[PDB]
Design a protein around this ligand. Structure first.
Ligand SMILES: NC(=O)c1nnc(N[C@@H]2CCCC[C@@H]2N)nc1Nc1cccc2cc[nH]c12
Length: 269
């Protein structure tokens, strides 16, 4: 629980979602001042922000955005460390000169964060390029844990009972059975990779969610982005394995990405 007197907010909205807005601020730490990004709420939204805060409090990894704390003032606020370069999709739309090697570096970082989330038995449920935040052009972190869930000790998936879902990033078992696991987040990671190598283009352009479900059920998949290495398109296709049981987990994905990244680092030198 943070002290509102130690928080200074800038009026400009950096971005927004259903929850409310994201604003820049400054928080007075024990000695240094820390630049922060603050989610400010516009019943359900409050409980959802507190649950998001409860998830973030449990996470500690270099590739996951750190929560500083929460504050109840003019509205409920979730204060995070600031990722100065903002969302990855917007960044790549604006910086088309970012190299294939640099994209591999960033998505590999996302895979390391996801490997940690999987080991931690949390499901993200909103893994998309808009939710990867850049600290620098060479350092990505995962944010936006509003749909995330801590798996029960006796289950490897979360069963949704009820909603407004990011359907183009969801695996077939999410749509068909409402079952969310770390393997479902792997499918989303495949879509995130496609977005990254497409420089922030939207996936399944011009298609309704129902048309996407129909396409995937026919065994069809999005094509290879221009300039995307064959090895990376191969990995996207493996993430898009229909049967959740034969789809790789994040330890297998991160290892494949790590090895290819070292190969490219070797080709560069
Ligand atoms: N820690 C953070 O910086 C941070 N964390 N989460 C989120 N969530 C957003 C929700 C709304 C949609 C985008 C995101 N998914 N936005 C953060 N910053 C941020 C937003 C927007 C612009 C900029 C420029 C620098 N930073 C920006």
């Amino acid at each position: 629980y943070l002290d509102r007197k130690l928080l200074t907010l800038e009026d400009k909205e950096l971005g927004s979602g259903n929850f409310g807005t994201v604003k820049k601020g400054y928080y007075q730490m024990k000695k240094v001042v820390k630049t922060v990004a603050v989610k400010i709420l516009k019943p359900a939204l409050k409980d959802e922000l507190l649950a998001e805060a409860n998830v973030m409090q449990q996470l500690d990894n270099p590739y996951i955005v750190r929560m500083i704390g929460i504050c109840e003032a003019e509205s409920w606020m979730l204060v995070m460390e600031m990722a100065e370069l903002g969302p990855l999709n917007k960044y790549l739309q604006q910086n088309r000169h970012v190299t294939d090697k640099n994209i591999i570096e960033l998505v590999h970082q996302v895979s390391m964060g996801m490997k940690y989330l999987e080991e931690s038995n949390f499901v993200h449920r909103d893994l998309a390029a808009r939710n990867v935040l850049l600290v620098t052009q060479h350092y990505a972190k995962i944010s936006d844990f509003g749909l995330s869930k801590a798996l029960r000790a006796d289950e490897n998936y979360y069963k949704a009972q009820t909603g407004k879902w990011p359907v183009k990033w969801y695996a077939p078992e999410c749509i068909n059975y409402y079952k969310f696991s770390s393997k479902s987040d792997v499918w989303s990671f495949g879509v995130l990779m496609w977005e990254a190598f497409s420089y922030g283009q939207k996936p399944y352009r011009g298609m309704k969610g129902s048309e996407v479900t129909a396409m995937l059920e026919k065994g069809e998949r999005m094509g290879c982005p221009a300039g995307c290495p064959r090895e990376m398109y191969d990995l996207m296709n493996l993430c898009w394995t229909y049967d959740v049981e034969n789809r790789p987990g994040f330890a297998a994905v991160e290892l494949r990405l790590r090895n290819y990244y070292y190969d490219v680092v070797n080709h560069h030198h």
